Structure formats: C-alpha cells, structure tokens
Amino acid sequence: IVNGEEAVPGSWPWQVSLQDKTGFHFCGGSLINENWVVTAAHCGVTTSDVVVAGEFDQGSSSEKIQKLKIAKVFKNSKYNSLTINNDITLLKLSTAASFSQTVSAVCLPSASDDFAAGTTCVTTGWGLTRY
Amino acid sequence: TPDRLQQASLPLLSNTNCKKYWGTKIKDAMICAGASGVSSCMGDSGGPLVCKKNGAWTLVGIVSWGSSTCSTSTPGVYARVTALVNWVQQTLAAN
C-alpha cells in the first residue's frame, strides 16, 4: 500500500498472509470462516503455500501467529487471466483457524448490496509502500 | 515490502468515472477505488477492500490490479465480491 499507514495490531482480524514455504509474503487474503480463506486468483496459490493468521509484524518472533495448511485451491472457473476478470480463489484450510481477538471473519455482502461511488472504504496489506 | 500491516482509506469510484482512466479494461466483476493519494501495490493482491455497512465491515473488493507503477493518481481495480458471492456460497456448500 503506497502511502498507507501502519494498522493497529489485530484490528483487521481477517487479514491473512500467503507465504511460500520459504517464508516469503506474496499475497494477502481474508478469512470468511475458520476453514476458508478468500484470495485473488492471480496470486497462484498452491497447496505448498501457507496461510498465516494473527500476524501483524512479519519480522517478529514473539507473535502468536497461526500457520495453517491448504487442503485445496479453488480457482473460479470464470476467472479470465487475460482480462483479469473474476479474480477470486477460495482456499480450503486442512487445519481450521482458531478464532480469537486477533483472528475472526469478515462479512460477505448479498449480491444485491449497494456500495455507492464516493463511499470511503479501507484496504489493508503488506504490499510495497513505495515503488 | 513492509514488516507491519498497513491500511489506507480510499474512495470507491463509479465504473463510468473509472473507464475514464481504464477505458474498456473495466469489466462488470470489477470495482474501482483510490486515485486519491494512495494505491494498492505488489504484495497486496488477494487482500481486502472493506466498507462498513450497518456497523460491520463487509468485503466489497479483492485487490486485483491497477497501475504498474502503483500511481496514487490512478484508481486501483478490485474483484467485485457482490458479483462473485454466489459462487463463494455454492463452493462452501458443495465442499
């Protein structure tokens, strides 16, 4: 997030980090319940990658984070990688996340929900802060 | 990338106003936000774009793409969850 700002530790309890087995953060994601994570289809997640919940400072060893494994990767069949349309993948955890103060679910809207232009929303992530 | 989790407020745009920046690349399962001095960037993909609706944070978009340079004056493009939620519902029920 270019020009973003540091979040309050644990205030975005659904934010997860997709890391390869090397420990390298490559994508973000959101928990929609204890067994499923929603992420982008472009991320190219495989079952060797790990979902880390409860994390704030990727460079700390004292955090009580949860490294969860992926059972199956569900790439939306409507996903078009040439237009980058329908960019959503569901990840089923082989080991369910344990919900607490720093780990919980984000709500999903109804297909009929309206979010008008001009509305201020928030986006979070560990992506580049300067390019 | 940064060690600590970052956040940023940003405005949703109309798909019409976004087509001014992106023309025909803006499809129906896409929603725009930003062009306000902040931008999602590499490493942010898959992450959430949340809006507070009736007291709770609900998932409106998924970081998908945008300016290759992460220009804070160009709007970012997110997967429109409202157009994909029926598939999520189907998937969670079958599996």
């Binding site: 205030s11 309890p13 709500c107 | 507070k52 609900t58």
Partner: peptide, 10 residues
C-alpha cells in the same frame, strides 16, 4: 462477522 475485537483506528 465484520466486527473486530480490537477496533481499527483510521
């Protein structure tokens, strides 16, 4: 859902 235990500060 969508209501964190630790409130975000914007």
């Amino acid at each position: 859902c969508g209501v964190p235990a630790i409130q975000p500060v914007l």
